[PDB]
Amino acid sequence: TTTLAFKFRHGVIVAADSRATAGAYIASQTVKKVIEINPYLLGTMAGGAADCSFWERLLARQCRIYELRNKERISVAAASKLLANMVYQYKGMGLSMGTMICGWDKRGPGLYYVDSEGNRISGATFSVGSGSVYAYGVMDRGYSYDLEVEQAYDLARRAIYQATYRDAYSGGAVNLYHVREDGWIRVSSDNVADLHEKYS
Amino acid sequence: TGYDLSASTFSPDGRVFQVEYAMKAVENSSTAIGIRCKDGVVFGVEKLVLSKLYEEGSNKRLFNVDRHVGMAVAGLLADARSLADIAREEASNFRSNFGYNIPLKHLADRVAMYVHAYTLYSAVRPFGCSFMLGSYSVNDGAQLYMIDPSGVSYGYWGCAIGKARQAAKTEIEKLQMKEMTCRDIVKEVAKIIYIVHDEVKDKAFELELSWVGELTNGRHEIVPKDIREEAEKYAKESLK
Amino acid sequence: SRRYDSRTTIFSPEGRLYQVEYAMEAIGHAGTCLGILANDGVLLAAERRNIHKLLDEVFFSEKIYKLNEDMACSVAGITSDANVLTNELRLIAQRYLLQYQEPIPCEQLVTALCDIKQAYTQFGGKRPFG
Amino acid sequence: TTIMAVQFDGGVVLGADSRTTTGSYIANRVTDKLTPIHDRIFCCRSGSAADTQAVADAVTYQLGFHSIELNEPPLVHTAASLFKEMCYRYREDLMAGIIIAGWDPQEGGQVYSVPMGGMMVRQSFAIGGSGSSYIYGYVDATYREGMTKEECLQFTANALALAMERDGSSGGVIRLAAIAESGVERQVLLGDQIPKFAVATL
Amino acid sequence: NQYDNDVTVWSPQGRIHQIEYAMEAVKQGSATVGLKSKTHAVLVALKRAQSELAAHQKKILHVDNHIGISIAGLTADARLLCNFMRQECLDSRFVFDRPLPVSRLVSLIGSKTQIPTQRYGRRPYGVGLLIAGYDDMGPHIFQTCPSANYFDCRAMSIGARSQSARTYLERHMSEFMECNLNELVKHGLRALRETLPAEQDLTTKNVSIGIVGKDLEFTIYDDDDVSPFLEGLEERP
Amino acid sequence: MEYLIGIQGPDYVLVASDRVAASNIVQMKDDHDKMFKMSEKILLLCVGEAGDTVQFAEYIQKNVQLYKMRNGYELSPTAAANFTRRNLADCLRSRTPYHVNLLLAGYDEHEGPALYYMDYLAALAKAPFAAHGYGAFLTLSILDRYYTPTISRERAVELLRKCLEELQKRFILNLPTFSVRIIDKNGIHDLDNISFP
Amino acid sequence: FSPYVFNGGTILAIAGEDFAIVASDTRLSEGFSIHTRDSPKCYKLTDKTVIGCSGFHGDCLTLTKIIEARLKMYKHSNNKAMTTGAIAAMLSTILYSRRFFPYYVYNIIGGLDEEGKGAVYSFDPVGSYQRDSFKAGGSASAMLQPLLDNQVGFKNMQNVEHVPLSLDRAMRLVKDVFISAAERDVYTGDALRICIVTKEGIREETVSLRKD
Amino acid sequence: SYDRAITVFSPDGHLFQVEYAQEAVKKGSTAVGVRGRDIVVLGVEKKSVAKLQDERTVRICALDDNVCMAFAGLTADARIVINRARVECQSHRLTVEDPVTVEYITRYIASLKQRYTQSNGR
Amino acid sequence: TQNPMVTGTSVLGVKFEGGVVIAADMLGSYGSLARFRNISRIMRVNNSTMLGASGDYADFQYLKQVLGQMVIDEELLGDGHSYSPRAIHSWLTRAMYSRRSKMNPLWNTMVIGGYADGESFLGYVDMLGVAYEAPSLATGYGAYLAQPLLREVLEKQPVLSQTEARDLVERCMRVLYYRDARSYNRFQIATVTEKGVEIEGPLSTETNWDIAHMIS
Amino acid sequence: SEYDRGVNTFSPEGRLFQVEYAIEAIKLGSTAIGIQTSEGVCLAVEKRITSPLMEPSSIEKIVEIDAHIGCAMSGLIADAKTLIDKARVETQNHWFTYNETMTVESVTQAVSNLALQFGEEDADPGAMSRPFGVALLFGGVDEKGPQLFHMDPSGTFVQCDARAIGSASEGAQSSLQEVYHKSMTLKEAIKSSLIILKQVMEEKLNATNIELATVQPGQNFHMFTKEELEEVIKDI
């Protein structure tokens, strides 16, 4: 699994692979590792597929309830805090979750890393999964806050592509999302075979 | 004064009037009769039909509490059904713990204690039903017990509950039931039922008969239809 | 149950809690207690209603109780209720000393006891402390 | 431990050894493993001393209450059922092998076995314990139908002595009880009363 | 009166006045008829609401593929009982893989309803029920009263002015056993028409039908679906 | 492993922590704050197991601020430390123990500066200087060598720099930048971060 | 004491434009023995949905009963039958409710969506599910899946027309793939049960596989 | 536990206990609030005993740094409500990481009072 | 139970035209010791249903208690509805699965046989809750030694008579006495037909030991 | 006396006393009107403003249950908050479990199940002591189209075409009888409801003393702003 996210001047970039594995058998090559919590808020999934899906869907329900009660959209920090509090109750019981919560709120862009161990950290650049180490190098050598939108797209695609090249448990396609002030857009879904053709 | 509103209140003369009012509820019901002979027990109920729209077998007042134990009720039918379920549960628990069929005296004592537990508190209401339990076994013989809304259980040779209990008792005292057979007892039960019924006030009725004895191998069951119809013929002949 | 219920914790048509007013009447008839605050100290002075010749002296005082190392109280009203409340005051002070390892401030102790006494005027169907 | 019960026409005969062991040390050498549950109902206890004592006391309590409420002498089957219920419910927690023998007016003399696990079976003779293994062939060869009380007593004593010779966990004295309608008679066999069998010598 | 406020108080006459007051709730409600042939069972319900905009309130409910009920009295109590019956049938299918016999369901209902009548601070269920069912013993019509008493009927009407329907049914009950489905439903509709004030008539709006039988799951015919049955029904006398 | 250090002076307390948040072999964050503000003159520094640190620290913070709201004055450092030890000790034998190592720094108007050390078993000690982590093993002797009770805050910052330089020379972990705060009668002051290029 | 055992079995689902196909083998086994040769692993839920369960048989039976009950409850509460996607989401929550003592069941749902098109949903034992176009599950899933990737998905094929899948070609492919599976997998054999879901309803077919 | 129903309906559709609580409010000290352009003004009536009251620890109370409350009626009830509100404010700071809105705490207090008009034994 | 103590070996079942036949030996083993040699492991549930069990005899006796009480409770109502063999099979499956899910199994393997509405029923339940139906069944070591012969007969001739089925059961019992160490020479045969449930008591098999002289 | 009777006592006429008294409490509230058309559902309520110092924007008589369902309330408005929270939680739980939107009838039924759940004994701690003094109008759009439902304190819920609740219900209901036809457009419904509300209100209808909301197929729940309200008010 390779998931990636970074904040730049024009918003948040989220990218993921699409390979689901059960041992060394490739169960799927079209899995969706990004959950759409609300039109302004996204989450990523790494680790246990069922765990991440269930708990982030539960977060989506709670966030909708918040919006109904308080007549205002929830903040990224509050959503990440809710998820961390929810998963702390099941510590030591074997949950495997690694999540990035991304959005735009009254403080601007936001990106938070939440894992089942208990971490909740804010940051400008994150990568989770088996291939996260390979994505970190490309992202760190290419990342600037003053990137242009197409440059940011290309950097994210390149980092996920290199991770799939080196990691056995990553592959399939690169699914890309751009969080902007008016909401997130689906940018592209590019197969890594076509990216191999483009980059070689 | 309000000395009669709770079952946890005595009156100045030492009476619990709520239990007496429940007994009044029993006296308004139609009459059930039980007769015991050396080899068995016979139960007869006058079952009033309040409309012709009702099927045959509606509002049964005779229950099977155990495969050897039968029950004949009078009063409030819902209370009687709840009590029948209590008795069934008692018999089941006895078989599961001690491993044989419950003696009738023990079952009557347990159910009478359960009934008595409702005559002590303001939080619950007394039962508005009276009932007879009947059984046969080789070891214990033939047993007939009666339980009233206060919780008193007594053994009988012949018992009657309901509206025409006194007239029925007068009729039952005319039988030398100890040296009779269950076949004769069925005809006599039917005859007494037809005697005590008041056609002017109560319109129409069915006769509900059951028995338990060596004739049935200690199993409580409904009297077979041919025996029932023969007994009804005898009863209608006797009334002229 | 409804017939025998005295309904202690309800309102009157004028917004009054009647059992509390009756308990105040009980306190108006007890022995006098006065407290005076000075620059160098503070004092309590009570009148003793146990003035029979055949009474024996034992203990420390009749109406003055020591709650802590730094606090004391005097009571007016029903004596048994006072015994209950003083036991509870001592418990509250020692629980605070266990939690924070400092002696409790006086107003915090008063507030805790008064929360207990407010509880009896709002729910439970029991009589207040006189 | 070696416990035995044999049924004859009109009653039962029970017999046991008298050894309590904590490992290889004999803590009690004259113990009574025959317990009066009721007037004509006895149990032979095998396994954990504490567990069997507790179960026996509980069954004695329950059976006495039952007999007072019913105003009848109890049945042997009822006592066996109470033992079976308790031993099956707490089978994970208890190590208790029981033999229940007795006389009642309805069925006569009866012998029931409740092994570990909590099953209940009626037998014409029952043996139990660790020494019971060594006398299975002997009881199968020697048991005959229609024995009298004296023959049953001799048969039980012979079997128990044979078991005590070969088992390190059995020994001491032989305790016997005969239960019939007329009541209970108890005997102790010690020393030269215990049957002797010649040992092979070269 | 000191005897008429609690369900735990007996009167000196031997009655419980709260249970009678609860039966009054069934007497006030809208009328329903139920009847059975040798193969089918039919429930006919007179739907009505407060105003014409307000759609006629739902009187016939689906309990199981072989059981349906009609309601009279307090609708929330009726939904409580309906949920209880649905759960009992589901548990029977889970454990024994067979449908629950109808008589045993009515026994369970009677057990449920009797408990509140014996305890302080509780009330009866102010609902009268008509149960239509099919099982291995044939078709069944059952009546349930707030007193926890239940009846096995050949036919029955409950509600307001239902005595006239009961009179009609008694007059014609010998025919029902030999009827076909349309004839049986028309008999029920005539009985239900007997309760309406002389000006009112039976329309596709105010009538609901419920049918169960040997080879038919419980069906609720409302609206256009009832037009096949309302056809060929002579005018009132 | 994470590093905490505290130095007590005549009228001040000086605390420093590292700014690294790590997962496996990567540094996920390099500007992490490990200091929690209990009141206007109390700081709590917490390291240990993930999740346990923030949950315990924020529970303590919430209850201390609730004391301020309810009573109109603030807990003293000693009382806050004893409250913390009570809660950690109570949870020690339950099913949800916290694996946290803590330092508590404070200033009291009547008692002066205070530094408190607490391990994960909930033993509470009062110290002139203290440290937590694997780097403590390397820097406690430097504090023993150069600390005097009458030390000024300029000299305290110099001694802190010595300790952090030793960590840069001899420690196997990459701890490149440190957060530095001081507590005095005027409250909590953020000093410059100590960074090594 | 082990609360699980492996009872074998292979299931297959293929989605079409106007059809769905769910197939399974009918052998029930334990260890090296055969329990029965006539135990199908496909169950009808609605007139538009079929489910396929493989794994531990006790869990399969219990889950089938639970799903049927939930469908009846939904129809009581909401007055309509459940859709294929709603069933999939409900099953996901049912599976996650046993997260710390799981159901050892592999589930494939096949049916029609609300536009009348074919839909296949695949689950793992804890409730992660995905919408697919074809899917294999069970003991011979690793044998069956690559062939379906090649023949239905046209993967690794160069200049091959992507003609839409027809019901005839799909039926032939299912039969051939199960014939190949029964050759190499010891848990697969006996008979093949094929259920075809269309707007006209559900239609069943049975073909024979080798009995050794 | 005590499970009597205190607040019940009267024949005219009135909850008499609520009306009597409103009478209790009518007996209390007068509080006036004015909303300004930049300020908010809160004034209360004092019942002052000459020379003998100690007003050193008495404050108009603060729920957080940004919200103030004034009460009329039974003072002990007001103390209970204020402490509950303060606990809720700290919980909101923990769970949302932002200070409360005035309407949020007003909603919490109003729901608490409503809950006490529909509970057994209160 | 976590450790079985007194156990029974294998139970056999065959359906024929007009009913079902079930067979079991009368032995309870305490490890390798043939301890209780006269116990019955077949039960008459009702006039249409019979049951046989292998495994822990105490768990079997508990089940006999519960099932008997359930049948009596149903017969008290007198409403003309009885339990079918299929309903008892489903109840048994639910009971075993519930016990397994609590990690407290009933250590039994059960065969249910019945005849209702002119149709024969034969069903298998295992300790874990695996349940199914088949035309012949065998538990324990009979699954390896007896099921082959029964299956071979049934594949060729799918419908049997009572005589043929009984003969086949006797052959299979002989094979089990030859090759199972926990087996006994006395068995019982239960039959369910339209007349009900009939149990035939201590039966023995005729053995052949001629190969003993071929050892040389 | 007030405590002679329990809360679960029947009248001699067969009605629960507390429910009848709560229904009488319904008659003291503000007037709400709901009209159902093939183009959607319209809900109009009157804000009963007692003082010029009250800010009318804090009076919420119409709430959003979900994007497809809205509610209008009359009576004891504080009691309605529990029911509304239950409705919101039910719709979100349904979306979580089934990945679809709830029907208006199911939401109404779920809320109506809470209505008679009151008592003194044999009830869990945290149970209700009295009924709810609110009438609710639910309006929404589901696969059956635009649906309008009415709920009263007895637990009874019905489906309605046009409906008025509150103090002026009888006269408003008669007017709705006169003006409702099945072929109305949503604009006509809005205008007709405002005409009737103007007729029954004791104040003069301006854009700050009323509330109006619509639910249409495709468009979500919409609360009218002041400007749109003035646009509609101009015609009346």
Ligand SMILES: *C(=O)[C@]1([C@@H](O)[C@@H]2C=CCCC2)NC(=O)[C@@H]2CCO[C@@]21C
């Ligand atoms: C990724 O971490 C990974 C994915 O299968 C999983 C499935 C989809 C959504 C969440 C991410 N989880 C795993 O267990 C395998 C092994 C490592 O990477 C996986 C492919």
Ligand SMILES: *C(=O)[C@]1([C@@H](O)[C@@H]2C=CCCC2)NC(=O)[C@@H]2CCO[C@@]21C
């Ligand atoms: C017998 O089984 C035995 C006895 O100690 C014990 C004594 C009291 C009555 C019950 C039986 N139990 C034991 O554990 C030892 C070891 C073998 O036999 C014992 C002697």
